[PDB]
Swiss-Prot record, chains A, B:
Official protein name in the record: Glycolipid transfer protein
PANTHER family reported for this sequence: GLYCOLIPID TRANSFER PROTEIN, GLYCOLIPID TRANSFER PROTEIN-RELATED
Positions that bind beta-D-galactosyl-(1->4)-beta-D-glucosyl-(1<->1)-N-[(9Z)-octadecenoyl]-sphing-4-enine: D42, I43, S44, G45, N46, I47, T48, K49, H134, Y201
Effect of F97S: About 25% decrease in activity
Described function: Accelerates the intermembrane transfer of various glycolipids. Catalyzes the transfer of various glycosphingolipids between membranes but does not catalyze the transfer of phospholipids. May be involved in the intracellular translocation of glucosylceramides.
SUPFAM superfamilies for this protein: Glycolipid transfer protein, GLTP
Self-association and partners: Monomer.
Length: 203, 203
């Protein structure tokens, strides 16, 4: 479930984007703990919200840019803290977490003392994508939750279950996925900047 | 939204029980933090599951005892870790948490160093109702989450907002609620014992 390549105009079609990222919450099951259940629910809830908006008028909401532009017009001063704009503001952070996490694993980043954990990789991704938006209590909850993360080898095997591929092949496929995925996330973040749609409030 | 008194036969009608406890998740908002959102979702999800079972045949599922008896018959060896029996096994723990927490506040239990927090009351309730069913990682997550709890005075005011009553009056109304609520929870727990429907697994 690769993302589509970016067109020259860098516009991201909403329908296909939603279809693609809808495949990402299931992989949370690959972490193997109920600790990750509310996480999968938050990301799913963002996707549901954006889809619900889109479905009201797919042509009006053809692209993610259209969502922001249209909602900016539709709403008052509560924008961008409303609607699919808010849902995508949070979704992009989760998407970026996943991106940074996977990229870190693929790049061979590891605690040389504990080379088969994924805590360093998840911590980096958390720092880069989400931490700034969490108050100290939520940050404490993340640090605790990371102990529930699987072994690296197990996580990777879970990502390729049934395919009977080597770890090296699994990582090559992740790297392939990361190309259009990273590009797409980067464009989304830049659009939030350009539209002055980004907020910095903590939860 | 008082619970009904217990009849001589101690049978608890499912429909009215569900209607009554459906009023309890909203009061989570009285804690004033997003930290409690996944908690309210778990308890709501149990109530939804039990209601969904009940709705298949309200007469068959007339009482909570009926639910356990019928599901024991309907299911194989997966019972009691299935169905509305499992949902109620977890719901009762949340209900008991609430009971112990409220009763502790009403009984004047406090950290004399910090008399306007509710951490001691919530810790006691957690220890008595849920802790045993949590692995160490989830227990760490609870301890962290408790820091998000409101001041006692604020929590109580939030429970009576609009009514313009004193704290003393608010607590008298809580104490009234606790009579049939405690009795009902105690019967539920005893039924799980009698039916050998209780499990001790940790999450
Ligand atoms: C039982 C004993 C007691 C203990 C219970 C305490 C439990 C406390 C758990 C707290 C955290 C649950 C995770 C969810 C966090 C969320 O609060 C945030 C903000 O969530 C956003 O809020 C907005 C309003 O401000 C809108 O409602 C958004 O919704 S809208 O659709 O309405 O616009 C919504 O996503 N999302 C987040 O921070 C994003 C989560 C992304 C995670 C990325 C993967 C990381 C994996 C990490 C590895 C560990
Ligand atoms: C974003 C950065 C990363 C950080 C994110 C990490 C977040 C981790 C949060 C973890 C905890 C969320 C709370 C939910 C816990 C639940 O896991 C448990 C068991 O839940 C049960 O599981 C069963 C299967 O075994 C069935 O599915 C039940 O469902 S069924 O309906 O299918 O049968 C379900 O209730 N319920 C519980 O432990 C019960 C909760 C009761 C709480 C009572 C009020 C206490 C208030 C406490 C004050 C603090
Ligand atoms: C601390 C664990 C958080 C890990 C979050 C990753 C779960 C999603 C996995 C996405 C895999 C998509 C790969 C497709 C090639
Ligand atoms: C650490 C905070 C957990 C508190 C859980 C209590 C929330 C539910 C309040 C129930 C109030 C019902 C009173 C009716 C009279
Ligand atoms: Na690179
Ligand atoms: Na007493």
């Amino acid at each position: 479930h690769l993302l589509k390549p970016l067109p020259a105009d860098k516009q991201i079609e909403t329908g296909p984007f939603l279809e693609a990222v809808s495949h990402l919450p299931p992989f949370f099951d690959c972490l193997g703990s109920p600790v990750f259940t509310p996480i999968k629910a938050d990301i799913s809830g963002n996707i549901t919200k954006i889809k619900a908006v889109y479905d009201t008028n797919p042509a009006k909401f053809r692209t993610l840019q259209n969502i922001l532009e249209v909602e900016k017009e539709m709403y008052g001063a509560e924008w961008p803290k409303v609607g699919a704009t808010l849902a995508l503001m949070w979704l992009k952070r989760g998407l970026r977490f996943i991106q940074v996490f996977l990229q870190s694993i693929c790049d061979g980043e590891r605690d040389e003392n504990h080379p088969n954990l994924i805590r360093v990789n998840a911590t980096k991704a958390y720092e880069m994508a989400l931490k700034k938006y969490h108050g100290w209590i939520v940050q404490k909850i993340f640090q605790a939750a990371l102990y529930a993360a699987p072994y690296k080898s197990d996580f990777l095997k879970a990502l390729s279950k049934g395919q009977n591929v080597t770890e090296e092949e699994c990582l090559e496929k992740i790297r392939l996925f990361l190309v259009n995925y990273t590009a797409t996330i980067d464009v989304i973040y830049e659009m939030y900047t350009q539209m002055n749609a980004e907020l910095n409030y903590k939860v």
